[PDB]
Design a protein around this ligand. Structure first.
Ligand SMILES: Cn1cc(CNC(=O)c2ccco2)cn1
Length: 171
């Protein structure tokens, strides 16, 4: 059985209990914490690409009102985010299983842009998701996994100073 686990869940949960925020910029900002995933049960000899996307967790716009995040009343359907291909892709199962798979180079933007960067809507809430795609073999297969612990709201600047403090303390 293919097993997907979150590395450093301890720390993600401190961010989540405060409501996590991730900065987006026109050029694209790297994430902290970085999503790092433990994977076991791949075929060491099979070929895989690791893909990352962001599910809109709800259909609403969020605002930080009197020290508290609150959703708008006017949902709109959220078109799915673009997919980020891990730079190590494509690679053997052994490669992916020898150390946590770290998405350190993904950049989150608010503007449709050249390449690499993933465009999110500011003040929407997102749930990171990976796809593990068996490639080059005869039998294409996909395994997907969500990480509720890594939910955040996309912001152009931090609203909750308790987030600002955690980000610095642990970077
Ligand atoms: C780092 N990098 C690798 C590619 C090639 N593409 C892939 O591996 C791919 C696309 C869909 C599933 O897998 C593009 N960027």
């Amino acid at each position: 059985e293919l097993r997907v686990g979150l590395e450093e869940s301890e720390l993600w949960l401190r961010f989540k209990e405060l409501t996590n925020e991730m900065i987006v910029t026109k050029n694209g900002r790297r994430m902290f914490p970085v999503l790092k995933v433990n994977v076991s049960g791949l075929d060491p000899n099979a070929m895989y690409s690791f893909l990352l996307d962001f599910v809109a967790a709800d259909n609403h716009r969020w605002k930080y009102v009197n020290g508290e995040w609150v959703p708008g009343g006017k949902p709109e359907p959220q078109a799915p985010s673009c997919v980020y291909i891990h730079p190590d892709s494509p690679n053997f199962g052994a490669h992916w299983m020898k150390a946590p798979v770290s998405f350190s180079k993904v950049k989150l933007t608010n503007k449709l842009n050249g390449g690499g960067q993933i465009m999110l809507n500011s003040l929407h809430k997102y749930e990171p998701r990976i796809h593990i795609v068996r490639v080059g073999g005869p039998q294409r297969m996909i395994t997907s996994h969500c990480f509720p612990e890594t939910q955040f709201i996309a912001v152009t600047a931090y609203q909750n100073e308790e987030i600002t403090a955690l980000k610095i303390k642990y970077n």
